[PDB]
Amino acid sequence: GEDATVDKMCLERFKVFLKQYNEWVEANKDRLEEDSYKYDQDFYPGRRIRGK
């Protein structure tokens, strides 16, 4: 209940991972999509979701 709200939990080590993960995502998102188009001609389940 009120004792299990998120602010009550110790997730400090996972939050530092989230901060690093978000920085990596913003800096590599476009490059990863460009590589998907360069290497994979057609989409297929298991490939990177791209485009619209």
């Binding site: 994979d40 001609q41 057609d42 297929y44």
Partner: protein
């Protein structure tokens, strides 16, 4: 004259180009239709941009235009359509017909053709030999399916002049069947006559020597096509 016909070879001569536009002025004043049969000579294949500038004035004066598939793709974008033809799906075909690996008879959309369309243009015909005749009007568009058989006579076959027989067949039907411009079903039936003339023209060595008569063309059309398509 009700149809004034000329090729782009006259654009390679400074004298003929000036004379050509006086002839067009006279023909239009008397109600004639202008037929531009492109037939690009060797110099005009060098670059798309130079050729488009060179033919633009004569293109805009024409009411009827005939181009080959190669000429049309060269005038718009040669590499885009070559890439389009060479595409193969990686995993599976998008439909059953794509599995048969058949020859490409791509029908250009009127939006792809839009850079070349103008107000006075009544009919654009794009010829893939005698195999396909893509036609475009302000109101509609479509394709006439044709055929060819030069392997029926391997030692007398000669394709030279078959493009002229197709154009002559179009002109023969346009003058006598003016509803071709406005009726799609009528246009397709009359264009099959032009297909037949092109086919016969490929069965003889020499263009002039092998040009077919009307009754021979009409006979071949009825032999090739089922009666409902006549």
């Amino acid at each position: 004259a009700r149809i004034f016909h000329f090729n782009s070879e006259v654009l390679t001569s400074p004298t003929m180009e000036s004379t050509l536009f006086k002839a067009i002025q006279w023909s239009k004043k008397f109600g004639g239709l202008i037929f531009f049969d492109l037939n690009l000579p060797l110099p005009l294949w060098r670059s798309r941009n130079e050729t488009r500038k060179l033919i633009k004035k004569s293109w805009d004066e024409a009411n009827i235009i005939e181009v080959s598939q190669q000429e049309l793709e060269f005038l718009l974008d040669e590499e885009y359509y070559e890439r389009r033809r060479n595409y193969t799906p990686q995993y599976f075909a998008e439909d059953f017909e794509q599995t048969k690996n058949r020859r490409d008879y791509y029908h250009y959309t009127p939006e792809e053709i839009k850079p070349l369309w103008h107000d006075d243009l009544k009919l654009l015909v794009v010829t893939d030999g005698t195999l396909r005749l893509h036609y475009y009007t302000p109101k509609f568009d479509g394709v006439v399916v044709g055929t060819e058989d030069v392997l029926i006579t391997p030692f007398t076959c000669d394709r030279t002049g078959s493009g002229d027989a197709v154009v002559a067949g179009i002109m023969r039907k346009l003058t006598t069947c003016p509803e071709m411009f406005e009726d799609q079903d009528v246009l397709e039936r009359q264009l099959r006559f032009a297909v037949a003339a092109g086919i016969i023209s490929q069965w003889t060595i020499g263009a002039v020597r092998g040009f077919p008569t009307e009754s021979a063309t009409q006979n071949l059309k009825e032999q090739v096509y089922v009666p409902s398509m006549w």
